[PDB]
Amino acid sequence: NYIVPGEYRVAEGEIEINAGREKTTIRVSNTGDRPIQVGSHIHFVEVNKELLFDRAEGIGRRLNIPSGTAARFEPGEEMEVELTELGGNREVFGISDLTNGSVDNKELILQRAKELGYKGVE
Amino acid sequence: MHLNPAEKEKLQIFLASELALKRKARGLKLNYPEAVAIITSFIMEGARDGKTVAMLMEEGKHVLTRDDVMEGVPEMIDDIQAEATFPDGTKLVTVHNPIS
Amino acid sequence: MHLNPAEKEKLQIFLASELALKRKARGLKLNYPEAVAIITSFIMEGARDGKTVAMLMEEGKHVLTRDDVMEGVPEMIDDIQAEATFPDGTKLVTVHNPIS
Amino acid sequence: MHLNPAEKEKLQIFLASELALKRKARGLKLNYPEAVAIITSFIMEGARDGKTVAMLMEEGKHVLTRDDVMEGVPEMIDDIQAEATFPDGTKLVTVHNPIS
Amino acid sequence: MKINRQQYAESYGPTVGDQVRLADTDLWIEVEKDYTTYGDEANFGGGKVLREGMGENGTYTRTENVLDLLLTNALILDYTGIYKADIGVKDGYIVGIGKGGNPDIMDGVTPNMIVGTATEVIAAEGKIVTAGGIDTHVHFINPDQVDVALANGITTLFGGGTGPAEGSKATTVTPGPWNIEKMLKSTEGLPINVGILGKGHGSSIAPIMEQIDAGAAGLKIHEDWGATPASIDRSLTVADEADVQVAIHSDTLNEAGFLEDTLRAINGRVIHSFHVEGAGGGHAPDIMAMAGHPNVLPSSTNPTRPFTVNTIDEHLDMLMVCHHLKQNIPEDVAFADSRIRPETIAAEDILHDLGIISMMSTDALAMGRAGEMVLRTWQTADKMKKQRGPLAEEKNGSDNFRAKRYVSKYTINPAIAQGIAHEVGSIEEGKFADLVLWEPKFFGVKADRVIKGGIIAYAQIGDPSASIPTPQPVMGRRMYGTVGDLIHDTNITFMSKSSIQQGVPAKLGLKRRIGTVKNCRNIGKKDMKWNDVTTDIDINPETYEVKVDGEVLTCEPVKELPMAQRYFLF
Amino acid sequence: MKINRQQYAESYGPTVGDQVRLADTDLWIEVEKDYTTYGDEANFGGGKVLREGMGENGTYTRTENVLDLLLTNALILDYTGIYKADIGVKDGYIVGIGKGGNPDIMDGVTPNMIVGTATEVIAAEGKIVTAGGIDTHVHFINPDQVDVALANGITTLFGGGTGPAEGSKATTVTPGPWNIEKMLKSTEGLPINVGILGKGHGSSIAPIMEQIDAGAAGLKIHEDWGATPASIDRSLTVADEADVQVAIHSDTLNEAGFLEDTLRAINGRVIHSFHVEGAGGGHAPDIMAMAGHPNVLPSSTNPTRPFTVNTIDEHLDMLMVCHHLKQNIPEDVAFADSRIRPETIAAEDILHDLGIISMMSTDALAMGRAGEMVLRTWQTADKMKKQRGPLAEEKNGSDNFRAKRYVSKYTINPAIAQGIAHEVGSIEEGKFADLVLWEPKFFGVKADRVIKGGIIAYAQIGDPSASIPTPQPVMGRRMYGTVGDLIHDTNITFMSKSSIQQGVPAKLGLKRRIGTVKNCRNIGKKDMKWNDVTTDIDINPETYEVKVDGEVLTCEPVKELPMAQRYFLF
Ligand SMILES: O=S(=O)(O)c1cc(O)ccc1O
Ligand SMILES: O=S(=O)(O)c1cc(O)ccc1O
Ligand SMILES: O=S(=O)(O)c1cc(O)ccc1O
Ligand SMILES: O=S(=O)(O)c1cc(O)ccc1O
Ligand code: NI
Ligand code: NI
Ligand code: NI
Ligand code: NI
Ligand SMILES: [O-]
Ligand SMILES: [O-]
């Protein structure tokens, strides 16, 4: 009965994010000497060239983390992250200029990634 | 005096704090704006005294306690922020959860 | 503090009342604006204390007497009106002929 | 109260002087605006008391001395001027070199 | 990934089923639905979602379904529902309520709510967002009244006056073509929407109509100008021809007629009955009976709201001093006693709760408080919940039904009454972006940010000399929407069709947005959202006891209210 | 007759070789030259020189080499020199720096500096006169910020925002055509020069360019909108076509790239790097390395200026609270620690002193103080003199070299960076008469009189009810240049060439003077006056130690500053 003005009384239960989308776990290593922090909604294949991971597995995906949060990689740190699928039209434009169109164009994405030195094109 | 805009505004905070301190001295539990004024003025007077930002961050949590204020006021005040002229110029003080 | 326009203005009345009370404490007979400020601030502090409108209508007639003010000031003040936040919200207090 | 523009402004000077006097009472050496406020308010309260312009020109030089203020403040203040309502209307007081 | 609900609500605001306390009242609102896609919530900042190629689209030009402003994660409280959504604004209007962001990568994006290069962001997570209040009983007496209204979330002032002239101090009237012109010109500088009422008094049509043609938005019939059968009749004849609303403050004195005579003069035509309870004015003692009729759009003014222990003492004295009434003259005492009645004030609380009085208003500076319409609406709702219990129509333990009934009284209903709900009065697509953001702890007390025409006009914000905007002193301040020429685009002057057709704006050099008053003459009580009850209200001439459906409506005054001493410095 | 120098300087201000202390600092400026003819000094008053037939010419009409205003006996402090002169203004512009008066009877009168019937007089004897400050990092969040800036001698605000919307609270951005239009209209009421930055974000040219065509003066790339390689590239492509400047607050998180990636995206093109030290934002920890490049115009924002004992505590906490960062979340702590670095803040003091950071700015209300750009510039210069000694380039024991290096950081250099130095940024013939008079005791702390377009806009002045202007309270106040329509003629809205060619001012009804942005794309570091140093700046990724020419740049914080508690009431 103590009154906290404007307080919430949230319902029971939990909120499942990115429900019904495929999830993928991958290992990622920061091979650089400065920290890299990666947001929830950046097309994962287009992150910093010094992050080493299987770049193919980041195509059409982003981090499966709450909207507006980020994953941090200290220099030299390797860890696993979980990715979810991009939605909507599944197109990306801009960012690192690796995609500029459908995310289905994997070979074109990887070719540009490889040519520009994004680590982990395999 | 050559008062600038901030100096003129901040006189208001001192005044509200004086008003609030008189209310507390006659035994009233303080409300939201009263409590904020008292803590804010304490910070700016502290800077004027030459205290450090770290000292004021600590002290600002002990200016008023829950029994000094009305129900709910502690939970309404998440932090209090004030800028004042320290010996080394204007600095920002933020006091988190000043009233527990 | 989230001051609204009326809160900012009314701080002025408190301040004028403080000024006037210092003048009275050093033995001056008070003038028209001094007297109005003192009685007005007394009403708003009264509301803050939780008094009723009827109590303040009575008390406001005994805050200052004619020997506290300059010649003519009692007859210049036909009434004093103030709004303040009582426990049951803003109310208007009117004190008729406060100084007999 | 029927405050006019100057009355409203000049309340600010009283307030700054109160603030400054509290700073001095806790042992601070006063700064430029503090010192100006204290001396100015003293002049206007003096007029209110019914003193003459010549008395305030004399007294205003003895309100604060150099040991009351920070280094350089005496030499920053060449004079202090204030208008107030004397028994014979508004007059200007100028206090030259108030702090020697 | 799952997120527990407490953390979800802290980050994004509340979602379906969660409840939020309104200020320090006992009233709880519950999120009814949410337009989001969980995981694709929009948010703005360092490493957040609304960034180029991510939640912000980098392809589309402004014309191409891109927003000028997105309010993210708003808890909307409106006659149309209590729900969670993003709100998209473009060209000063609300264009989309749904889910904003970038269809490149996000599911569920409303097609015209793209965040693009052209888009500004306001974070509304953890805020309650309502329509701006519509105050239809404003005396224009002191321009300082405008900021007072904005600070309590009012965005539209309808009324009259020329400043502190006695006619304006008594009545919401700007009389005649020249005073109307002068006040339309003054309005150019007022940072709020405005509509002006002419004098609804005369025995020939022409003197009254010429005010409408001059740019009045409506008329006010007031007893102080003679609320006679003729003035009532002519005003309503003009209103019916001109398509504007008529407000009435009836003949308290019963000099030319009793209530039934005023109703006969009205003759079934639409009218807005001001301060229908009657402390603020009208046929003594039974004027409140107006609120039972199908052609009456009934409003209360705010000092009687709600019934408290200081109410009667405060009013008796206010009435006596304003009318130069003497305590030792028995006619003056009998008049005050016939006009200030605990029996009708108590019943007025219940008539609101029942949806029988449809609207709130202020009566600013005449016998009401410019900055307390919203405040007192909620204090009334809270008192009623405490005294009457949750209404039968509620469920889940929420107060949603009552919250929609009450928010309607100062948003959509006055807008419908006045013929302006095509522009303002609710958070709906196609209406003007007059939006008020509230921290729930301050809900109905002090607005956080007031948006006018899609630009912030007023905000509670801190020291302008600081490194950041939050340091003290935090106070209400005019923002950029009020400055320079932007004041013209962010505000609406409401005018009659005929004055608009006649080119009054160009004739006066008005630069503000011009709003048309319309569809005011074929509405009634049934058109008041959530407050559409018609009934036989009986007021006993001897005891002043009020009955509805043969039951006496009695209520106790309260000693304390929420939204009061916890918040205010004076 | 000879006059001793003490008396000469008391009457006319200082002359060649005399020195003047800047406020309560240790910094002394020396008069380098004087344009007067000794004995024919201009002065105004009872029995003084500027009287008809004497030092005022009574023959010539205004068109005939006569001034609208003469500032007599000014001690100019400018990138172009520290010297004594009269300053003549006409049509709102500086037309003559030299010697004013009447060629009938005086020797040495500059031919277009005649005092005539048309001439107003400002006495600048014993004052220091500088150009108005040019602040190129302004968040438009609270209109009260303008007077704050004017009171510390700032006359031009470049930046962005729409008021206290979250996008504007984080970034100096007015996004899109409609918000730009709205803010150009708001600007009509702001008594300061303004230029508006659009959102430098997108992956297609059109969404970005349309902001320039709408009336933006430049662009801002900010990490909160995605400071990605694409947004950087497109913005600079637009800027190169449009001839406007791009400011950058880079990707602190290193999410899409490290500093070298941002530099590759830039690809040699000109860019203004905001808060280059990085506490205010940018690639952690090495962003300050930007300031060594020839294509980078580097500025600092003001809260790190200079490095003091409370700086780190204040910043760590400010960062944490503004970003909702939690003390118990290790990623939040690591992020704060990577961003707030005593090693780069200390080196930043020295980089200024060395002419490697070229500009100061505020970051008003986002992470900087609107009224402290000038103040902190001098506090930095003073700290450096105390810690490093007079610079080698000095002589006569004066601090002239350092004073010119430092005054350039907030006057001419930002003006060059932004493409507006043809109009503003220095006291030179042919530039707009934006002039700030300072009493030396208040120099850099509180301006005496701020002149905008040749009319005083702001002054420290007393009781308006008094017999004279000096009685208390003396405070900052808006003057006649701000009132009515005069606000239009005394201030400049800076706009892109294309928006001007497209008629945006007429389309919006702008009445202000319109300034053209130009010559921003083919400048570099070498064009920054007195601050033109390019070098290899190394920032150690492990220890954050900064090196220049293989020497570690380390410095101590100070416990006290001048221009602080002696002056301010709070
Ligand atoms: O006309 S007044 O401004 O003096 C006024 C006094 C009063 O006691 C009640 C109402 C009023 O409008
Ligand atoms: O529900 S009650 O009939 O008890 C009631 C009490 C009250 O104090 C005001 C209104 C009411 O309807
Ligand atoms: O958005 S706020 O105005 O609440 C703000 C708070 C804060 O702590 C730092 C920066 C800010 O812009
Ligand atoms: O000249 S010093 O190397 O002693 C120095 C000291 C200092 O405290 C800051 C900068 C400096 O260059
Ligand atoms: Ni009425
Ligand atoms: Ni009324
Ligand atoms: Ni920045
Ligand atoms: Ni910034
Ligand atoms: O009324
Ligand atoms: O910034």
Side-chain angles (χ1 to χ4, degrees), chain B residues 9 23 71 76 81 83, chain E residues 441 467 470 477 566 569:
Chain B
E9 286 202 357
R23 289 167 173 182
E71 175 171 316
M76 293 175 75
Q81 307 172 18
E83 299 210 340
Chain E
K441 70 192 185 191
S467 54
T470 47
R477 306 174 193 258
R566 208 180 322 282
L569 192 63

Side-chain angles (χ1 to χ4, degrees), chain E residues 42 79 110 128 154 177 217 227 239 248 294 318 366 382 412 426 503 528:
Chain E
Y79 88 88
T110 307
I128 296 166
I154 301 183
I248 187 166
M318 183 183 309
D382 176 78
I412 188 65
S426 65
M528 302 282 94

